[PDB]
């Protein structure tokens, strides 16, 4: 038992991480087979970043302008191209450590592991959710661009995120691995803000089920509610609407615990209206919304 924010083991991604330098700008790239993927703003100078024209900036580079370092081995660049907001740098050596992998784009509300990197070197691993407003609440410092986010299924790494930038509020924005941004953000050092965020309701319910599975039952009650009456409360507290598909997804956890989804919604209603009166759930004094139903089942069941 116990319930912790848990990342996937990172070894398979660590063996893909390289350092990419253009001129005086450096960041991380992802080396799969004979291609290195990195944020395109590696080709910016500091004064290029307020209003870059990337197509112009790239036309003025050639292969020998990109220094790629895999450990203390330089990889020779033999081709380059732009794809949306990432660069594809063809190198002369296929990565011998390339895992089975997929490029997937995730939905808001879904989670993934971030391998934070600097200078091509992995620094730490943590778990993130894609917020409803398409930002992520990460931990990233200058030099971390090109760090990736991923999920692992069997021995297959599904890459879903590459890091680009930090917004003024301290949240983070990036692209999928085809270089398309999550959310209405651009890779420019301009005034930009995220849309209003909302709380991920199905995830809060999943975490409440994790809590019961771990023996925190104090917030439970004999009341039930209707989906309609619950969603009226959710909208008032800036929670996303709960769908019948969410109720279905929570099915297995509702079965395991014997607590009907709409019964658990009655608990969430009371917590929203009255708070926790000084108690905690799974060590938190706030309602947590960055665990998916899959994350709960995974951890409260043990898939290695």
């Amino acid at each position: 038992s116990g319930f912790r924010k848990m990342a996937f083991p990172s070894g398979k991604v660590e063996g893909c991480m390289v350092q990419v330098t253009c001129g005086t700008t450096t960041l991380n790239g992802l080396w799969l087979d004979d291609v290195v993927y990195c944020p395109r703003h590696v080709i910016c100078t500091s004064e290029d970043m307020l209003n870059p024209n990337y197509e112009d900036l790239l036309i003025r580079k050639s292969n020998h302008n990109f220094l790629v370092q895999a450990g203390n081995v330089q990889l020779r660049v033999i081709g380059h191209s732009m794809q949306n907001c990432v660069l594809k740098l063809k190198v002369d050596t296929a990565n011998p450590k390339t895992p089975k992998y997929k490029f997937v784009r995730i939905q808001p509300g879904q989670t993934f592991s971030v391998l934070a990197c600097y200078n091509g070197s992995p620094s730490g691993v943590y778990q993130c959710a894609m917020r409803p407003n398409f930002t992520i609440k990460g931990s990233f410092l200058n030099g971390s661009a090109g760090s990736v986010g991923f999920n692992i299924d069997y021995d297959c790494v599904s890459f879903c995120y590459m890091h680009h930038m930090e917004l003024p509020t301290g949240v983070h924005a990036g692209t999928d691995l085809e270089g398309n941004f999550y959310g209405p953000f651009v890779d420019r050092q301009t005034a930009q803000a995220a849309g209003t965020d909302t709380t991920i309701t199905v995830n809060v319910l999943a975490w409440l089920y994790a809590a019961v599975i771990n023996g925190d039952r104090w917030f439970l009650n004999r009341f039930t509610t209707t989906l309609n009456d619950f969603n009226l409360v959710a909208m008032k507290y800036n929670y996303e609407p709960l769908t019948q598909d969410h109720v279905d997804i929570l099915g297995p956890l509702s079965a395991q615990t014997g607590i009907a989804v709409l019964d658990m919604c009655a608990s969430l209603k009371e917590l929203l209206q009255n708070g926790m009166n000084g108690r905690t759930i799974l060590g938190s004094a706030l309602l947590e919304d960055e665990f998916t139903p899959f994350d709960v089942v995974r951890q409260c069941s043990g898939v290695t």
Binding site: L27, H164, D187, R188
Partner: peptide
């Protein structure tokens, strides 16, 4: 305030 690209 402005966004920051996080190369170095």
């Amino acid at each position: 305030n402005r966004a920051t690209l996080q190369a170095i």
